[PDB]
């Protein structure tokens, strides 16, 4: 059976701190900010061609 | 005469520039959020993007009212720039009822959303324009109600009076939940995409959009965060300068505008930063979020503030 | 203790279901009864026409106003004892006369709006309270939304009440422009001589008066009364009349008024000759409302009209209330039922009612003789005491036209009896189910007041003498 | 599923229920009730124990209620 | 008692005070000096100011025409105080209102030249600042140490003069 | 001629210029709704308009000490019961028919 | 590490508002003759600033100081006429 | 400088013009667009007279809420409307030409207190006289207009704010009384 | 008093002499309240008091709640019908 409100391990105040202060919103905000500070994947086309095989057609 | 026309020249030209460089800043930072180069560059040549696509945007097709709503949307977005102060007592027009004006123009800004749906009408497109209008007014409520609970500590409708009151402590640090809910109500006035069902002559809506972006950033910056205030800086000057001179007033106006622009720039970056990370809302979720859950908290914060001013002496004098 | 009721019940009705509405109205009924029983010792506050100004020159509490303040709760108990209680326990009588969820809220908001006029001193309490009660009539009318006539009626009443509200606000603004104060006692009998005020004070009067049915503009109200359902209209015909008429009578701003005397005559003419050739019962009944609300601009012309007014208002409210409750009883015996909201529409429909039961026609006969001023009834002394004041203060042609109006009006009061005592051909021999006990005891009590109020006439005059002089 | 127990079928259990399942109406009504209830219980404790109330500001020029004793000086 | 118009048109009147009101020595001080010397002309000329507002009270509506005698004497004694503060402490008075001409004439921003001026005037001219209506066990606000409300820029000349008054020991 | 008024004269000129350059450079050439949509705007007005009843208190909060406090508290506490009316009655929620009503399969 | 091309737009926006506000404070100090502006102006303060304009002679807030008034100070006092406001 | 004199009579003429464009328009939205023009001509007059606070309150609630309300209604509703044709509206002209004269002259009558009925009207126009504005130095704090409204609504007229609560209460209950259809 | 009387009289005759739609009635009713305000506020200014402004700030609110109520009355009228008629209710 899915557990009710009263068979929950955390308090209602502890749950409301996650509810009002957007606990996992800032986590996903932090992930995209981590991606802001690393070196991108992008390549110049008319002056560099991507990696190819000998069996290419 | 010449004394003030050069002054409004400098201000209009600076704000007109800054709104255009935001259209480049958003493309760049969302490029590096997703590991692309994005636009090639950002310099003095860097406006020639936003210039060039602002030119080419005037080359497509459109299919008396259609003339008026982009116009009134842009002039409503542009007249609200006087009333922000940029330094102590520096306004383009000084008025004791600046928040009442700022509030009346946040009220005037809704009309272009109505009159845009009339042009090239369908049944379903008209309904969609209705939905964008109703979310715009719905979050305008909580905007206005928190303006009240900020000026409860000031008890004055002047804006430099707010910031000079704010000198001892910013209003953001006691009322931190208020900062959080204002930031989301601030990306709610605008159509920023956590809050953008109802999107997903055009040059005026395009310009006035970013002008509203940076202008509600200004409205955050003076009343919640410190407006032009960074620190006390009384001690550094007594070592640098010997007496008041035009160099000294230049240096202080410079550091005050720097402290204002850093607030506005970090907040403006956070708008584009909250754009990328989240998907958008169902409209029922939008209205439900505005009314049923957030606004009872708003009545509660509204009752808990005067009672806290009541428990101590602490009523603010005009 | 209205707002102690309203604030409580609005939270109580917000959470209760649609089936609970009857028992909610029963609770509010018993609450109003005990507010009248346990708190009616406040008559002792005045003993020599002592008047209090409360909330700082804003409300005015005297004894005329205490009597109207008690009268409105009493009639509201009789009205709320209708929606609380079933008429019969049948399928028809459940699908007829259904109370909406928000109806019991809007009644008490209207009583707040009606009480804050009779108690009112300032013009701003006047304006806010006419607005509160005008909204409540806009929404008591429109709450039966799934009715074509009721929605058209609420939309008409909206714009006509809006014009007369702006006319009142213009008069209030104009009196403010010629004199700095808002209160009516800034007049204090030295202004009016040295100041042309006649045009302002009449336009303030005529603004409220046209909201009630003063007869150049009588055509819209008759249409609203005929179009609403038959239970909204007993309330929205009683309440705004008595509330503003006791305002305009408490504060005698138009004495010797020629405009008021003309429109009084025009009311007594067109009401008594308008009701003559009319086949719908709520029509006939609303022009009986019109002539009787035009024995009112008469007392409004007078000075010192507080025996004639108060006696005639409680006369009229009991008589009004009783005859609507008679035709609400009469709908069971009729052969044809149309129009679920408004079940009896024609006065042709209540034929042969004496062969169905005789005592409901005995009741109907005493009320219809009380409207036409038949002397052993309580409705007689109302016209007697109007005429002991009309002639007292010099209105002689008014008295003759009053008499002729009463005689022309009796011609369409007696049509109710001419219809109701006739042969029907299909008599009732046995009804299986009987009408609700308390809801017929209320009508029996309202009869015996009408037929036996001359007993206590003399006590009332002595009591009156003490407590208003 | 979590259903309504009722405020009348145990108050404290109902407040514990509403704190978990409807925190947008518990912690909104409980932050707004902590104002007018704390204004009736925490103010005399302050006026006795922390500091008493302030002296009122003047609003107009403060006229005394004397009868002009005759001043001497600054004649010409 | 009223705020000006749509289109108000200013005018003056080249005329004279007619016959019987003598000539007077009116205050030619601007907002900064008389805002600076406000407590001292309030401390010396208390009963004359009191007497003028009392006389204006007792002649209700007569008013302006009635106490020409006596608004003559509040001007004379206020001019007396400010001539005395000129000849007494022109340098430190000037320091205080050259401070107070910035900072919106907020009194909050100029404690430093203020306390120097108050020592100078209490020494030579023996008048003292009081905030009346202030019950005891309430510190007056221009005496407290580490206030919450500090100015933006302490002006330079009063920093120097206050430091030299510390070094001399007169403060 | 102050510096406030050139700005709100000069901006409609800027808009007219950005509009006339658009007219110079461009190419040219009932369904039923739900009650919640109408109700959001109809009901928005009595909640926008108590805010402006709240605007004169917030300026004069010092003068009405201890007394205008309680008047404003009672004003707001009368408004909260109409708020709890609309949130008890589920007024803004829009509903649909996606449930199969979850009736158990009854045989014979 | 940090991207410089991402931060140059915000650097330009920051520098634009910075140079704007510095120019603004210098223009205000040049108009007033070396003193900062009055941001909150009472009715009292407005009447007082008009009296200062009347006292010092022509210039805005010169803030002169004298033991007495000049003889022209008695006669230059103005009353404001005002249209009918129909 | 006396270009800056006729500013009130200008806005009076503009209000006349603007109501002529209210009651003569093709679309139902064109009429409310000239209506928000009328609100802003009014707010210019209210600033002009000496009331800067009100003009912005009129912008906040009259081209604020109730504008958006009416624009909104005219969007999501269909409303048939005819044009101002001469064949359906010239029949009203000899009543309008009487009622204009009578209602304007009578609305300019009650500002006077004589008893001649021609000296009553001629006191409405015989006012070209310039009020003289003195400076009194009695006021010490900037109690502007909004402070005094907040002092009078809250102490002297607290009951009007407290009945006003019931009116706004009713403005919330009413649309839910009607437009819901519970169950 | 000219601008208020003119808005009141002309808005009144715009109310009275329509036969084309229902919304011109609403907006002429709203501009009548504006016309009453334009007279009241100038009598507040010229007499030097707030009490006409007191009645002004009250009648702003009553015009607001009036519009809220009356447009819910119109949606009642429109729900049951199909299309609001040209000639009127
Ligand atoms: C201080 C201590 C801290 C504060 C107290 C902390 C708790 C606060 C109360 C919590 C609110 C109650 C509640 O159930 O939660 C939310 C409640 C939800 O209830 P629910 O469980 O969802 O209902 C669903 C059931 O199916 C529906 O069940 P139901 O049908 O049974 O209805 C439930 C009930 C739910 O409502 C309640 O139960 C609350 C009732 C409490 C009323 C009294 C509270 C105020 C106490 C004042 C104390 C004064 C002394 C202070 C002295 C201090 C001195 C220093 O609603 C009602 O029955 C109607 C309300 C009746 C109110 C009667 C008020 C008038 C008489 C009382 C005042 C008399 C004064 C006389 C003076 C005048 C003389 C002229 O939310 C609301 O509906 C709004 C509450 C409105 C309160 C009024
Ligand atoms: C809603 C939309 C709102 C519209 C607003 C625009 C206009 C609003 C104004 C209208 C407002 C509504 C008008 C209501 C009707 C006006 C009421 C009215 O007539 O009082 C008139 C004023 O005697 C004029 O001097 C009346 C003379 C008035 C001037 C006549 C008009 C000039 C037309 C030129 C052609 C008199 O009354 P009244 O019977 O008490 O007066 C009597 C009588 O005069 C004396 O003989 C008696 O001795 C004395 O006892 C006294 O009581
Ligand atoms: C208000 C009342 C008056 C309105 C007009 C005013 C007149 C002035 C004052 C009058 C004073 C009124 C006093 C109350 C009188 C009390 C009283 O006689 O018992 C009641 C009337 O009870 C009300 O009907 C109660 C009356 C209404 C109150 C409703 C809530 C209780 C008499 O019913 P009843 O025996 O025939 O009812 C019988 C009887 O109860 C059983 O045989 C059956 O159970 C039942 O079905 C029915 O057949
Ligand atoms: C035990 C209760 C059981 C439940 C009953 C619930 C409601 C009963 C409601 C009404 C019953 C009738 C009471 C009438 C009181 C009149 C007071 C009065 O004549 O008013 C006079 C002045 O009137 C007037 O100007 C003229 C009014 C003319 C009335 C015309 C009709 C009267 C004929 C029948 C009425 C009398 C019948 C008596 C039946 C035994 C003021 O005196 P007052 O204000 O001090 O009287 C109230 C004192 N009190 C509250 C303690 C009772
Ligand atoms: C659209 C018109 C609506 C008018 C809105 C009024 C805007 C406003 O708030 O003006 C305030 C401002 C001065 O107000 P205040 O706070 O007292 O200034 C203190 C100075 N230290 O006022 C000003 O400085 C200038 C006023 C600008 C408003 C221009 C309206 C002129 C109307 C002319 C009619 C032409 C037709
Ligand atoms: C002190 C005593 C009381 C203690 C508690 C503290 C109360 C004070 C705090 C008040 C501040 C409240 C902030 C806003 C509350 C948001 C409510 C919420 O997040 O959840 C409710 C709502 C969904 O409603 P529901 O049906 O209940 O969903 C259940 C799912 N858990 O969720 C939603 O509909 C949307 C959820 C996302 C909201 C939009 C997100 C905007 C993204 C911005 C995030 C912040 C970005 C910051 C950027 C700069 C950071 C450096
Ligand atoms: C600390 C102790 C005090 C805490 C008391 C908390 C009570 C919590 C109220 C509550 O239970 O709310 C939830 C409940 C929802 O009802 P539900 O069963 O979910 O079905 C309908 C949903 N619309 O009930 C509801 O319907 C919500 C109704 C209440 C909404 C309150 C929000 C309005 C703002 C309140 C401001 C504070 C007022 C406080 C009173 C001040 C005067 C004392």
Distance CA E79, CA E28 (A): 9
Best of F30, F38, F39, F42 to mutate (most H CBs within 10 Å, chain H): F42
Residue with the smallest CA separation from ligand 2 atom 20 is: C199
Pair of tokens at residue C276: 């003559």
Q: Using a CB-CB distance cutoff of 8 angstroms, which residues of chain I are in contact with residue F32? A: none
Give residue D10 CA to ligand 7 midpoint distance, Å.
16
Q: How far apart are the first and last CA of chain G?
A: 70
Q: In what order do the strands lie in the sheet with H131-133?
A: E8-12, G78-82, H131-133
Q: Which residues are F11's β-sheet partners? A: none
Contact F14, B78 (CB under 8 A): yes
Q: Using a CB-CB distance cutoff of 8 angstroms, which residues of chain I are in contact with residue G83? A: none
Distance CA E28, CA E34 (A): 9
Distance CA C310, CA C312 (A): 5
- Asked if I43 reaches chain G (Cβ–Cβ under 8 Å), the answer is no
The CA distance from D64 to the nearest CA of chain F, in Å, is 23
Q: Within its chain, how far is the Cα of C200 from the centroid?
A: 27
Pair of tokens at residue D71: 């001043």
Counting Cβ atoms within 10 Å, is residue B76 exposed (0-12), middle (13-18) or buried (19+)?
buried
Q: Using a CB-CB distance cutoff of 8 angstroms, which residues of chain C are in contact with residue I33? A: 166, 169
Write the DSSP symbol of residue B226. Answer: -
Q: How far apart are the first and last CA of chain A?
A: 58
Distance CA E35, CA E97 (A): 8
CA angle C4, C5, C9 (to 5 degrees): 125
Distance CA B163, CA G8 (A): 29
- Asked if B10 reaches chain G (Cβ–Cβ under 8 Å), the answer is yes
- In 3D space, the residue among E34, E143, E157, E132 whose CA is nearest the CA of residue E85 turns out to be E34
Q: What are phi and psi of F27, to 5 degrees?
A: -120, 135
- In 3D space, the residue among C181, I39, F64, I63 whose CA is nearest the CA of residue H148 turns out to be F64
Distance CA A53, CA B173 (A): 59
Write the DSSP symbol of residue B241. Answer: -
Q: Are B232 and E150 within 8 A, CB to CB?
A: yes
Which of H109, H120, H160 lies nearest to residue C124, judging by beta carbons?
Answer: H160
Distance CA B198, CA B137 (A): 14
Contact H84, H92 (CB under 8 A): no
Q: Within its chain, how far is the Cα of B304 from the centroid?
A: 27
Distance CA B75, CA A23 (A): 39
Residue C265, C-beta contacts closer than 8 angstroms, at least 6 positions apart: C398, C401
Distance CA H96, CA H92 (A): 6
Name the residue with tokens 């005469």. Answer: B1
Residue E94, C-beta contacts closer than 8 angstroms, at least 6 positions apart: G65
Which residue in chain G has the smallest CA separation from I1? G86
Distance CA E83, CA E77 (A): 10
Distance CA B59, CA F22 (A): 9
Distance CA H151, CA H133 (A): 26
Distance CA C43, CA C31 (A): 20
Pair of tokens at residue H75: 């969007």
Residue B174, C-beta contacts closer than 8 angstroms, at least 6 positions apart: none
Distance CA F87, CA C258 (A): 54
Residue C406, C-beta contacts closer than 8 angstroms, at least 6 positions apart: C272, C372, C373, C383
User: Is the Cα torsion angle C246, C250, C254, C257 positive or negative in sign?
Assistant: positive
CB-CB neighbours of B274 under 10 Å: 19
CA angle C459, C465, C469 (to 5 degrees): 160
Residue with the smallest CA separation from ligand 1 atom 19 is: D7
Contact H161, I55 (CB under 8 A): no
Q: How far, in Å, are B22, C337, H116 from residue B202 at the CA level?
A: 17, 62, 64
Counting Cβ atoms within 10 Å, is residue G26 exposed (0-12), middle (13-18) or buried (19+)?
middle
Pairing of strands H131-133, G78-82: antiparallel
Distance CA G73, CA G56 (A): 9
Q: Using a CB-CB distance cutoff of 8 angstroms, which residues of chain G are in contact with residue A37? A: 1-3
Name the residue with tokens 């634009």. Answer: G16
Contact C206, C170 (CB under 8 A): no
Output the 3-class SS for chain C.
CCHHHHHHHHHHHHHCCHHHHHHHHHHHHHHHHHHHHHCCCHHHHCCCCCCEEECCCCEEECHHHHHHHHHHHHHHHHHHHHHCCCCCCCHHHHHCCCCCCCHHHHHHHHHHHHHHHHCECCHHHHHHHHHHHHHHHHHHHHCCCCCHHHHHHHHHHHHHHHHHHHHHHHHHHHHHHHCCCCCHHHCCCCHHHHCCCHHHHHHHHHHHHHHHCCHHHCHHHHHHHHHCCCCHHHHHHHHHHHHHHHHHHHCCCCCCCHHHHHHHHHHHHHHHHHCCCCCEHHHHHHHHHHHHCCCCHHHHHCCCCCCHHHHHHHHHHHHHHHHHHHHHHHCCCCCCCCCCCCCCCECCCCCCHHHHCCHHHHHHHHHHHHHCCCCCCHHHHHHHHHHHHHCCCCCHHHHHHHHHHHHHHHHHHCHHHHHHCCCCCCCCCCCCCCCCHHHHHHHHHHHHHHHHCCCCHHHHHHHHHHHHC
Q: Point out the ligand nearest to the CA of residue C24.
A: 1
Q: Is E8 helix (H, G, I), strand (E, B) or coil?
A: strand
CB-CB neighbours of H81 under 10 Å: 18
Q: Which residues are G79's β-sheet partners? A: E11
Contact C183, C60 (CB under 8 A): no
Q: How far apart are the first and last CA of chain D?
A: 96
Q: Using a CB-CB distance cutoff of 8 angstroms, which residues of chain E are in contact with residue H50? A: 3-6
Q: Which residues are B61's β-sheet partners? A: F27
List alpha helices for B35-81, DSSP H: 47-56, 65-79
Q: How far, in Å, are E3, E19, H17 from residue H12 at the CA level?
A: 22, 48, 9
Pairing of strands F27-28, B61-62: parallel
Q: Is H79 helix (H, G, I), strand (E, B) or coil?
A: strand
CB-CB neighbours of E39 under 10 Å: 17
Distance CA B243, CA B247 (A): 10
Contact B8, F10 (CB under 8 A): yes
Pair of tokens at residue G29: 């100090």
Distance CA F39, CA F50 (A): 18
Write the DSSP symbol of residue D52. Answer: -
Distance CA D6, CA C18 (A): 19
**Alpha-carbon Rg for chain B in angstroms:** 21
Pair of tokens at residue E91: 């340098």
Distance CA C345, CA C331 (A): 10
Q: At what angle do helices B98-108 and B65-79 cross, to 10 degrees?
A: 150
Contact H76, F33 (CB under 8 A): yes
Contact H168, I61 (CB under 8 A): yes
Q: Report DSSP letters for G19-69, one per residue.
A: HHHHHHHHHHHHHHTS-----S--HHHHHHHHHHHHHHTSSSS-----SS-
CB-CB neighbours of E116 under 10 Å: 23
Q: How far, in Å, are C313, C414, E12, F85, G59 from residue G52 at the CA level?
A: 70, 88, 16, 59, 9
Q: Is F93 helix (H, G, I), strand (E, B) or coil?
A: coil
Domain containing D66 equals: 1-76
Q: How many residues does chain H have?
A: 183
Q: Is E106 helix (H, G, I), strand (E, B) or coil?
A: coil
Contact B101, B95 (CB under 8 A): yes
Residue A53, C-beta contacts closer than 8 angstroms, at least 6 positions apart: none
Distance CA C165, CA C159 (A): 10
Kindly give the number of the ligand 2 atom that is closest to the alpha carbon of H102. Answer: 33
Pair of tokens at residue D4: 């309504």
Give residue F81 CA to ligand 1 midpoint distance, Å.
11
Domain ranges of chain I: 1-89
- In 3D space, the residue among C372, C237, C214, C226 whose CA is nearest the CA of residue C296 turns out to be C214
Q: Which residues are E11's β-sheet partners? A: G79
CB-CB neighbours of F13 under 10 Å: 10
Q: What is the dihedral of CA H108, H112, H115, H116, to 10 degrees?
A: -50
Residue A55, C-beta contacts closer than 8 angstroms, at least 6 positions apart: none
Distance CA C278, CA B186 (A): 64
Distance CA C367, CA H62 (A): 52
Pairing of strands C59-61, E8-12: unpaired
Residue G46, C-beta contacts closer than 8 angstroms, at least 6 positions apart: none
Distance CA B104, CA H36 (A): 14
Give residue H52 CA to ligand 5 midpoint distance, Å.
7
Distance CA C109, CA C106 (A): 5
CB-CB neighbours of D60 under 10 Å: 9
- In 3D space, the residue among H56, G44, G39 whose CA is nearest the CA of residue B158 turns out to be G39
Residue F47, C-beta contacts closer than 8 angstroms, at least 6 positions apart: B141, H172
- Asked if C418 reaches chain I (Cβ–Cβ under 8 Å), the answer is no
CB-CB neighbours of H161 under 10 Å: 23
- In 3D space, the residue among H161, B96, C440 whose CA is nearest the CA of residue F75 turns out to be H161
Contact B198, B285 (CB under 8 A): no
Which of G3, G26, G40 lies nearest to residue B246, judging by beta carbons?
Answer: G26
Angular region, E104: left φ>0, alpha ψ -120 to 50, beta rest: left
Distance CA C290, CA C284 (A): 10
Pair of tokens at residue B148: 């009240």
Residue with the smallest CA separation from ligand 6 atom 31 is: A19
- Asked if F70 reaches chain H (Cβ–Cβ under 8 Å), the answer is no
- Which residues does a 6 A CB cutoff place in the pocket of ligand 7? B 296, 299-300, 303; D 4, 15, 18, 22, 25-26, 28-30, 32-33, 36-37; F 77, 80, 83-84, 87-88, 90
Q: What is the largest CA-CA distance in chain A?
A: 65
- For residues C352-376, one letter each, b for 16 or more C-beta atoms within 10 angstroms of the residue's C-beta and e for the rest, the string is bbbbbbeebbebbbbbbbbbbbeee
User: Is the Cα torsion angle C68, C70, C74, C79 positive or negative in sign?
Assistant: positive
Distance CA G64, CA E99 (A): 14
Domain containing H56 equals: 1-183
Distance CA C49, CA C463 (A): 12
**Alpha-carbon Rg for chain D in angstroms:** 29
Q: How many residues does chain B have?
A: 318
Q: Report DSSP letters for C142-187, one per residue.
A: HTS-S-HHHHHHHHHHHHHHHHHHHHHHHHHHHHHHHSS--SGGGS
Question: What was the resolution (in A) of this experimentally determined structure?
Answer: 3.3
Give residue B219 CA to ligand 6 midpoint distance, Å.
21
Pairing of strands G78-82, E8-12: antiparallel
- In 3D space, the residue among C258, C172, C177 whose CA is nearest the CA of residue H110 turns out to be C177
Distance CA B265, CA C42 (A): 68
Residue I68, C-beta contacts closer than 8 angstroms, at least 6 positions apart: F42, F43, F45, F46, H69, H171, H174, H175
Strands (E), chain A: none
Kindly give the number of the ligand 1 atom that is closest to the alpha carbon of D25. Answer: 16
Residue B152, C-beta contacts closer than 8 angstroms, at least 6 positions apart: B305, B306, B309, B316, F58, F61
Distance CA H35, CA H24 (A): 12
Q: Is B244 helix (H, G, I), strand (E, B) or coil?
A: coil
Domain containing E159 equals: 1-171
Contact B102, B158 (CB under 8 A): no
CB-CB neighbours of H28 under 10 Å: 21
**Alpha-carbon Rg for chain E in angstroms:** 20
Distance CA I89, CA I68 (A): 19
Distance CA E95, CA G18 (A): 32
Whether D31 lines ligand 6, by a CB cut-off of 6 Å, is yes
Q: Is G78 helix (H, G, I), strand (E, B) or coil?
A: strand
Contact C437, C86 (CB under 8 A): no
Write the DSSP symbol of residue H132. Answer: E
């Amino acid at each position: 059976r899915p557990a009710t409100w009263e068979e929950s391990e955390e308090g209602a105040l502890s749950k409301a701190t996650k509810y009002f202060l957007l606990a996992e919103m800032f986590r996903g905000l932090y992930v995209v900010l981590e991606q802001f500070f690393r070196a991108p994947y992008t390549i110049y086309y008319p002056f560099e061609k991507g990696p190819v095989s000998p069996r290419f057609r | 005469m010449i004394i003030n026309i050069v002054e409004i020249l400098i201000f209009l030209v600076c704000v007109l520039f800054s709104v255009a460089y935001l259209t480049v800043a958003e493309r760049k930072t969302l490029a590096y959020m997703q590991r692309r180069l994005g636009p090639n560059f950002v310099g003095y040549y860097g406006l020639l993007q936003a210039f060039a696509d602002a030119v080419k945007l005037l080359l497509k097709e459109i299919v008396i009212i259609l003339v008026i709503s982009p116009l009134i949307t842009l002039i409503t977005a542009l007249i609200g720039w006087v009333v922000i102060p940029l330094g102590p007592g520096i306004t383009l027009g000084e008025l004791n009822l600046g928040i009442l004006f700022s509030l009346a123009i946040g009220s005037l800004g809704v009309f272009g959303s109505l009159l845009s749906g009339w042009s090239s009408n369908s049944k379903y497109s008209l309904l969609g324009s209705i939905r964008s209008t109703a979310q715009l007014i719905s979050y305008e409520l909580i905007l206005t109600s928190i303006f009240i609970i900020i000026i409860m500590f000031v008890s004055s409708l002047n804006i430099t009076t707010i910031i000079e009151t704010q000198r001892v402590v910013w209003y953001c640090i006691p009322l931190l939940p208020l900062l959080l809910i204002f930031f989301i109500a601030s990306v709610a006035e605008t159509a920023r995409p956590p809050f953008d069902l109802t999107e997903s002559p055009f040059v005026f809506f395009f310009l006035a959009e970013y002008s509203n972006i940076i202008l509600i950033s200004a409205f955050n910056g003076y009343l919640l965060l410190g407006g032009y205030l960074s620190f006390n800086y009384s001690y550094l000057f007594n070592i640098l300068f010997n007496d008041y001179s035009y160099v000294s007033f230049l240096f202080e106006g410079l550091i005050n505008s720097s402290a204002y622009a850093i607030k506005l720039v970090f907040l403006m970056f956070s708008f584009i930063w909250v754009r990328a990370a989240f998907p958008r809302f169902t409209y029922d979720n939008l209205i439900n979020f505005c009314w049923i859950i957030l606004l009872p908290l708003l009545f509660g914060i509204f009752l808990i503030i005067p009672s806290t001013l009541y428990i101590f002496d602490s009523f603010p004098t005009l | 203790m209205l707002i102690l009721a309203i604030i409580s019940l609005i939270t109580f009705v917000s959470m209760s279901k649609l089936s609970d509405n009857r028992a909610i109205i029963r609770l509010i009924n018993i609450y109003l009864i005990l507010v009248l029983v346990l708190d009616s010792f406040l008559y002792l506050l005045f003993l020599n026409n002592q008047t209090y100004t409360v909330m700082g020159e804003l409300l005015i509490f005297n004894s005329f106003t205490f009597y109207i303040d008690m009268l409105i709760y009493f009639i509201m108990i009789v009205i709320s004892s209708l929606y609380g209680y079933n008429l019969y326990n049948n399928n028809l009588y459940k699908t007829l006369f259904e109370p909406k969820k928000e109806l019991i809220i809007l009644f008490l908001i209207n009583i707040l709006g009606a009480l804050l006029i009779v108690h009112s001193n300032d013009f701003i309490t006047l304006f806010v309270a006419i607005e509160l009660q005008s909204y409540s009539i806009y929404l008591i009318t429109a709450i039966y939304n799934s009715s074509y006539k009721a929605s058209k009626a609420s939309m008409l009443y909206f714009f006509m009440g809006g014009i007369l509200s702006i006319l009142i606000a213009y008069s209030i603004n104009t009196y403010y422009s010629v004199l700095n104060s808002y209160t009516l006692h800034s007049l204090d009998s030295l202004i009016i001589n040295t100041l042309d005020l006649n045009l302002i004070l009449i336009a303030l009067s005529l603004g409220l008066l046209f909201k009630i049915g003063i007869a150049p503009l009588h055509k819209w109200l008759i249409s609203i009364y005929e179009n609403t359902p038959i239970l909204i209209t007993i309330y929205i015909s009683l309440i705004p009349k008595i509330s503003i008429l006791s305002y305009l009578v408490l504060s005698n701003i138009s004495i010797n008024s020629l405009v008021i005397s003309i429109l009084a005559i025009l009311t007594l003419l067109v009401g008594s000759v308008g009701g003559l050739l009319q086949i719908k019962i709520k029509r006939l009944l609303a022009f009986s409302g019109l002539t009787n609300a035009g024995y009112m601009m008469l007392l409004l012309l007078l000075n010192n009209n507080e025996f004639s007014y108060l006696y005639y208002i409680t006369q009229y409210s009991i008589s009004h209330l009783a005859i609507f409750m008679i035709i609400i009883f009469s709908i069971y015996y009729i052969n044809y039922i149309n129009n679920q909201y408004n079940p009896i529409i024609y006065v042709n429909q209540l034929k042969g009612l004496i062969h169905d039961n005789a005592y409901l026609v005995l009741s109907m006969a005493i009320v219809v003789f009380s409207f036409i001023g038949i002397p052993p009834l309580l409705g007689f002394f109302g016209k007697l005491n109007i005429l002991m004041s009309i002639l007292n203060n010099g209105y002689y042609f008014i008295s003759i036209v009053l008499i002729v109006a009463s005689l022309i009006s009796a011609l369409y009061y007696l049509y109710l009896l001419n219809v109701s005592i006739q042969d029907k051909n299909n008599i009732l021999i046995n009804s299986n189910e009987t009408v609700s006990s308390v809801l017929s005891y209320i009508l029996s009590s309202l009869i015996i007041l009408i037929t036996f109020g001359f007993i206590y006439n003399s006590l009332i005059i002595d009591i009156f003498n003490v407590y208003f002089n | 599923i979590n259903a309504n127990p009722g405020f009348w079928n145990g108050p404290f259990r109902y407040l514990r229920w509403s704190a978990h399942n409807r925190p947008h109406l518990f912690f909104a009504f409980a932050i707004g009730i902590a104002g007018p209830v704390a204004a009736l219980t925490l103010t005399p404790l302050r006026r006795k124990y922390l500091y008493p109330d302030h002296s009122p500001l003047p609003q107009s020029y403060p006229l005394p209620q004397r009868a002009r004793e005759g001043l001497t000086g600054f004649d010409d | 008692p009223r705020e000006a118009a749509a289109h108000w048109v200013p005018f003056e009147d080249k005329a004279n005070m007619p016959d019987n009101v003598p000539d007077v020595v009116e205050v030619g001080a601007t907002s900064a000096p008389l805002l600076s010397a406000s407590y001292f002309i309030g401390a010396k000329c208390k009963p004359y100011n009191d007497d003028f507002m009392l006389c204006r009270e007792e002649s209700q509506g007569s008013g302006a025409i009635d106490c020409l005698k006596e608004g003559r004497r509040v001007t004379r004694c206020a001019v007396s105080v400010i001539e005395d503060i000129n000849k007494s402490c022109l340098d430190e008075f000037r320091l205080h209102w050259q401070c107070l001409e910035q900072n919106n004439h907020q009194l909050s921003g100029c404690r430093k030249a203020e306390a120097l001026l108050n020592k100078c005037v209490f020494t030579k001219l023996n008048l003292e600042k009081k905030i009346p209506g202030l019950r005891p066990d309430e510190e007056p606000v221009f005496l407290k140490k580490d206030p919450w409300i500090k100015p933006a820029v302490d002006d330079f000349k009063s920093v120097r003069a206050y430091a030299e008054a510390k070094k001399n020991g007169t403060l | 001629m102050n510096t406030f008024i050139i700005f709100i004269i000069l901006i409609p000129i800027v808009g007219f210029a950005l509009l006339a350059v658009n007219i110079l450079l461009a190419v040219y050439k009932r369904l039923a709704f739900n009650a919640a949509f109408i109700l959001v705007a109809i009901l928005f007005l009595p909640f926008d308009l108590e805010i402006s009843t709240l605007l004169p208190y917030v300026m004069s909060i010092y003068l009405v000490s201890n007394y205008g406090f309680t008047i404003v508290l009672l004003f707001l506490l009368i408004l909260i019961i109409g708020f709890v009316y609309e949130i008890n009655t589920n007024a803004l929620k829009i509903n649909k028919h996606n449930k199969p009503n979850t009736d158990s399969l009854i045989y014979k | 590490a940090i991207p410089f091309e991402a931060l140059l737009p915000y650097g330009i926006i920051f520098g634009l508002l910075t140079a704007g506000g510095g120019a603004m404070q210098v223009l205000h100090v040049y108009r007033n003759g070396g003193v900062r502006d009055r941001f909150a102006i009472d009715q009292w303060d407005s009447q007082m600033m008009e009296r200062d304009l009347r006292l010092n002679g022509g210039q805005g807030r010169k803030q002169v100081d004298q033991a007495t008034a000049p003889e022209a100070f008695k006669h230059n006092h103005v009353w404001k006429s005002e249209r009918p406001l129909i | 400088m006396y270009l800056t004199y006729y500013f009130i009579e200008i806005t009076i003429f503009l209000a006349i013009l603007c109501t002529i464009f209210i009651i003569s328009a093709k679309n139902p939205m064109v009429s409310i667009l000239y209506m928000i023009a009328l609100f802003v001509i009014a707010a210019m007059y209210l600033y002009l007279i000496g009331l800067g606070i009100f003009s912005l309150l009129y912008i906040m609630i009259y081209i604020g809420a109730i504008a958006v309300l009416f624009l909104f209604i005219i969007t999501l509703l269909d409303i048939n409307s005819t044009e101002l044709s001469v064949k359906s509206n010239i029949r009203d002209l000899p009543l309008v030409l009487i009622s204009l004269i009578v209602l304007t002259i009578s609305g300019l009558m009650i500002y006077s207190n004589d008893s001649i009925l021609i000296n009553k009207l001629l006191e409405a126009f015989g006012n070209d006289y310039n009020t003289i504005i003195t400076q009194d130095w009695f006021n010490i704090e900037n109690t502007t207009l909004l402070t005094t409204i907040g002092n009078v609504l809250l102490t002297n007229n607290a009951f009007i704010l407290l009945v006003l609560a019931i009116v706004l209460l009713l403005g919330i209950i009413g649309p839910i009384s009607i437009t819901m259809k519970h169950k | 008093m000219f601008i208020g009387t003119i808005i009141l009289v002309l808005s009144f005759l715009g109310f009275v002499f329509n036969r084309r739609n229902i919304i011109l009635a609403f907006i002429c009713l709203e501009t009548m309240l504006l016309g009453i305000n334009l007279i009241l506020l100038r009598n507040s200014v010229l007499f030097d008091d707030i009490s006409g402004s007191l009645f002004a700030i009250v009648i702003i609110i009553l015009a607001g709640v009036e519009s809220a109520i009356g447009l819910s009355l119109l949606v009642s009228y429109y729900r049951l019908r199909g299309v609001i008629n040209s000639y009127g209710i």
